[PDB]
Structure formats: structure tokens, C-alpha cells
Write a protein that holds these residues in place. Structure first.
Motif, PDB file in Angstrom:
ATOM      1  N   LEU A   1       0.594  -1.130  -0.017  1.00  0.00           N
ATOM      2  CA  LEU A   1       0.089  -0.209  -0.012  1.00  0.00           C
ATOM      3  C   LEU A   1       0.734   1.161   0.058  1.00  0.00           C
ATOM      4  N   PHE A   2       2.374   0.966   0.485  1.00  0.00           N
ATOM      5  CA  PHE A   2       2.830   2.276   0.837  1.00  0.00           C
ATOM      6  C   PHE A   2       4.038   2.329  -0.606  1.00  0.00           C
TER       7      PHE A   2
ATOM      8  N   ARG B   1      -2.285   7.172   1.435  1.00  0.00           N
ATOM      9  CA  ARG B   1      -1.796   5.730   1.621  1.00  0.00           C
ATOM     10  C   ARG B   1      -1.996   5.055   3.128  1.00  0.00           C
TER      11      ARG B   1
END
Lengths: 147, 146
Positions: free
Chosen positions: A80-81, B89
Motif C-alpha cells: 500500500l505504501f 496511503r
């Protein structure tokens, strides 16, 4: 370069029937007859099933070995990062477009479907012309996603 | 530094309650006592309703100024490729964790709820500590989203 129209229409048509908004013949009916079409279908199915597969994987690990589920959670969370490939934003875009079409049919604005597709084709032809060609073109896409 | 366990509990409890998986007293039921908690709740709401609000805005362009509808689609699509800020995020991570807990309850695997919250806390405190600091710390997030 491939016919973007036929790509967009195959994917959207594939998604609409999958979800039960449309039926019968036309684009997206039966198997894709073009590897780029098949690759986008597969990219979109993967995208939309990612959460469910992740949950099952983590639930599974919960009793492979201890710490195993926590380590897999860390790995998936890292993504996700980091993000996925840049091709991932194009997959996201197709999925977004198809969802716009599905909601259209759902809220009885059927003509919106036809115009969303057109907007999609035109966005890809003008806006992403260079982003796509840069990233390796549709051919590169079909390699990574198509099998 | 904020109490990460309490933030995670508040956000996940807020989401489980909001979607009807649990009810009653506890984290996420009622007003948030900490500004950071309220910011994360709002962030997560925006994130999870963004598709629906996008569709609403596009349909309203069609129902009102059809001529500028394609423009709006392009703007939103643009934004989709730019790929939002770093903080987005972290919001996505909180939404993901809450969705795991919700699915654990749905699937009658309640133990996993407590395990996912602990994993989230460890991830934030250890794995992501530098990333949060680098992105400007929790105070900045709260300022941006609250």
C-alpha cells in the motif's frame, strides 16, 4: 496501436455481464478474442478480488505457523505504501470506468454507459498516449498480465 | 506520540458500528475524544465514499451542465493517475485494516479482529514509524484531515 475502443468495450461489457447488469451478445460476451483484452479482464478480476484473497490468506496463515499471519500482513501492508506497478493505475482506471458504467445501469441512466466508454477511449488516446507508450506500450501490458 | 492502540480501536470500532457489524458502548461509538481520532474517522469516510461522490458529481454535471461533464471526468481521471498525497496511503491502510475486521466478524472469525488490531498497532509503531515522521508526523495529518 490497438483499437482502444474495442478494448474499453470488451472490459466494460465483460464487467457488466459478470455483475449481472447486462446479458446476451455483444462485447464482453464469452472469452476475450484478443490477448490484450484477456489481460485487461484478468487484471481487473485480480484487482477486484485482491481484498478477499488477502483476507483468506491471512485467515489461513493464522494457523500455519505462529507469526506467519503477522508477517504476511506486514508484507501486504507494505504494498500500500510502495504501490503496485505503474500499470496498476491503468488497471485502476479501467476498473473505475467499469464501475461508473455499472452504477449508471443501476440508477437507470443507461445512455451514460455508452458515453463513459467514449470518455474512456478519448482519455486513453489523448491523455495517456505518452504514459502508455512510455511504460512499454500495450504489448508490455499484455505480457505482465495476460499469461 | 499518540496512543496508537487507542486510535486503531477508535477507527475500527467506528467502522464496524457504522456498517452494523457491532453495536453498543466502546471505541468508535459516540464522539471522538481525541482530535486525531476524529480526523482519521473523517479521512476514512471520505476515502470510502469517494467513488459514490464522484459518480454523484458526474451525474449532476449531466443533469445540469452536460457540456462540462467530459471535462469533469478528465479531471477526476487525472487525479487518479497523479496518485494522491502520502497521507492517502495511510488512510488506505486504516480502511484496509477496518475491512479485515469487518470481514472477520461477517465470517464468524472474531479472534482475527483482535489480531488485526495488534498487527496494525505494531505496523504503525515499528514498520511505519519512520514513514509517518518523514511525511510530517501525526500532528500534520490531524491538521490536514481534521
Amino acid at each position: 496501436a490497438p483499437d482502444t475502443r474495442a478494448l474499453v468495450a470488451d472490459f466494460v461489457g465483460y464487467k457488466l455481464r459478470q455483475k449481472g447488469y447486462v446479458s446476451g451478445a455483444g462485447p464482453g460476451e464469452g472469452p476475450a478474442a484478443d490477448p490484450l483484452h484477456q489481460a485487461m479482464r484478468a487484471a481487473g478480476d485480480e484487482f477486484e478480488t485482491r481484498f478477499r484473497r488477502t483476507f483468506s490468506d491471512l485467515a489461513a496463515q493464522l494457523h500455519v505457523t505462529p507469526g506467519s499471519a503477522q508477517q504476511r500482513f506486514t508484507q501486504v501492508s507494505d504494498e500500500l505504501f510502495q504501490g503496485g506497478p505503474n500499470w496498476g493505475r491503468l488497471v485502476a482506471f479501467f476498473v473505475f470506468g467499469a464501475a461508473l458504467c455499472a452504477e449508471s445501469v443501476n440508477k437507470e441512466m443507461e445512455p451514460l454507459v455508452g458515453q463513459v466508454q467514449e470518455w474512456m477511449v478519448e482519455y486513453l488516446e489523448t491523455r495517456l498516449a505518452d504514459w502508455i507508450h512510455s511504460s512499454g506500450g500495450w504489448a508490455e501490458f499484455t505480457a505482465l498480465y495476460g499469461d
